């Protein structure tokens, strides 16, 4: 996948985990991961402008706080990206959106709590593939910031 191609091209350490998707957090369940280590990747539209997306990476059981997310990227408001807008921009389907190797690279923000883990797990770009990666190494590839972007 473009995500794994990218990590191999940049020589970034990672472990590839594979599970049979039976065709929310399937990866945490099938790989037996603590939930708070399993992260999902969401895209938002800056001021609701579906051509100006940004990427947010947060534990799958957390909820994205939109006001926090808009502050983290210095915009007045964000709305969730429409499905087609997220798919055309990233080249992935929901269920398989990786923060890595998106067709269009956009600014990325990882929730702060990622830093409490030696490694985290993010989508590898298709259902059934999970990339285990140190959070600071993820942030280094993507130029990402760590910021509180979640509720509770």
Q: What's the chain look like in SS3? A: CHHHHHHHHHCCCCEEEECCCCCCCHHHHHHCCCHHHEEEEEEEEECCEEEEEEEEEEECCCCECHHHHHHHCCCCCEEECCHHHHHHHHCCCCCCCCCCCCCCCCCEEEEHHHHHCCCEEEECCCCCEEEEECHHHHHHHHCCEEECCECC
**DSSP strand pairing (49-59 vs 108-111):** parallel
Do 55 and 45 touch, CB atoms closer than 8 A? no
Do 45 and 81 touch, CB atoms closer than 8 A? yes
Residue 82, sorted as left (phi over 0), alpha (psi -120 to 50) or beta, turns out to be: beta
The resolution in angstroms reads 1.8
What angle do the packed helices 2-10 and 135-142 form, to 10 degrees?
90
Q: Which of 111, 117, 97 is nearest to 89 (CA)?
A: 97
Quote the domain boundaries for residue 67.
1-152
- Residue 61: give its domain's CATH number: 3.90.960.10
Tell me how the structure was determined.
X-ray
Q: How many domains does the chain have?
A: 1
Q: Compute, in degrees rounded to 10, the torsion defined by CA atoms 65, 68, 70, 75.
A: 160
Q: How many CB atoms are located within 10 Å of the residue 15 CB?
A: 10
């Amino acid at each position: 996948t473009p995500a794994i191609d990218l990590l191999k091209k940049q020589k970034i350490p990672f472990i590839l985990h594979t599970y049979d998707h039976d065709p929310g957090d399937e990866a945490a369940e099938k790989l037996g991961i603590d939930p708070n280590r399993s992260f999902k990747t969401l895209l938002v539209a800056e001021n609701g402008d579906q051509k100006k997306l940004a990427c947010f990476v947060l534990a799958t059981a957390n909820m994205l706080n939109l006001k926090k997310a808009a502050k983290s990227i210095g915009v007045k408001k964000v709305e969730m990206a429409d499905k087609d807008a997220a798919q055309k921009s990233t080249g992935y389907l929901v269920g398989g959106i990786s923060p890595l190797g998106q067709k269009k690279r956009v600014k990325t923000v990882i929730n702060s709590t990622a830093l409490e883990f030696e490694t985290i797990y993010v989508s590898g770009g298709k259902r059934g593939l999970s990339v285990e990666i140190a959070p600071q190494d993820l942030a280094k590839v993507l130029g990402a910031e760590f910021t509180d972007i979640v509720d509770e």
